[PDB]
């Protein structure tokens, strides 16, 4: 349980790693409690 990749990706999406920010979005899938 940790749905932060959204607001966390928003960072990398404009902090110097958008392409990598897309990787963060993958953490959003984190739904294993």
């Amino acid at each position: 349980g940790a749905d932060y990749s959204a607001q966390w990706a928003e960072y990398y999406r404009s902090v110097g790693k958008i392409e990598e920010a897309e990787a963060i979005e993958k953490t959003l899938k984190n739904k294993q409690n």
Binding site: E10, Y11, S14, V15, I24
Partner: peptide, 21 residues
């Protein structure tokens, strides 16, 4: 199949931005 290859670096670093409206 594609075997990854890289270091680790993504825990909980302080946030850079914070939007605005």
């Amino acid at each position: 199949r594609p075997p990854p290859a890289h270091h680790n670096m993504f825990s909980v670093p302080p946030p850079p931005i914070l939007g605005r409206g």
